[PDB]
């Protein structure tokens with residue numbers, strides 16, 4: 171199978187095959203994902219040896235997708251190991267892990283009262299919006315911009331957030347498998363996807379970030395979300411969320427895709443929130 175990006179067509183022959191003998195698995199991280207070494211530290215995405223032909227093409231497509239991107243806020247691909255079984259996709263090891271687990275585990279707590287501040291959250295949001303802007307200007311529609319699909323370079327203050335998973339854009343599973351909680355009305359009703367699909371999803375990711383890793387639409391099922399969103403329903407601000415941050419979310423959630431901001435506008439608004447002392451001086455809630 172072939173793949174086209176930035177006006178250039180590529181094939182499996184363009185993937186950087188890393189000799190299997192050079193790869194060593196260290197631990198399971200959560201097909202399985204392992205921490206590995208090539209010394210270069212890597213996250214090893216594996217293809218189960220017992221899989222369908224569609225699973226193989228999906229895996230090969232994902233390798234092509236990630237290898238052709240070149241941006242600071244998109245996970246790097248070191249190479250692949252497709253000439254040995256199980257097949258491997260070699261990614262940049264992101265020591266901070268996924269954004270969802272990070273937010274949940276690093277929540278300000280009585281023991282860690284200042285573990286995260288509004289500025290840490292704004293920096294993550296900017297980093298992903300910068301990755302989204304690169305995808306938008308390269309006419310790539312992600313389809314699942316969500317905390318679970320983002321990674322961090324380290325747990326510390328100099329962390330860099332990156333988009334780490336491209337399984338959804340690759341697929342294009344059933345109804346209860348569509349990430350309807352991250353989807354705008356024209357995507358779940360008409361199956362229409364544009365650059366404005368990622369804007370809506372980004373607003374939901376912003377809610378995930380500022381809620382510190384909660385599941386969107388608390389207590390609502392997929393069908394309830396579908397009906398809620400269709401009827402003009404929107405999420406409330408996460409706890410202690412400054413008004414200017416929530417305003418970015420509600421602009422991302424405009425019913426008409428044309429009324430939703432592009433990522434250059436999102437980045438300008440995130441930048442303004444970081445400069446605003448009334449935003450960054452707001453204390454995050456302390457979980458008991």
Ligand SMILES: C[C@H]1Oc2cc(cnc2N)-c2c(C3CC3)nn(C)c2CN(C)C(=O)c2ccc(F)cc21
Pocket residue numbers: 199200203213215245261262263264265266267268271318319320321333334335
């Ligand atoms: C495929 C996988 O990639 C990585 C996974 C990790 C780090 N870095 C890369 N590149 C990683 C680590 C290591 C620091 C220990 N801990 N956790 C919790 C994860 C996440 N995870 C198990 C994944 O399956 C995952 C999730 C989202 C994603 F977007 C890509 C990946």
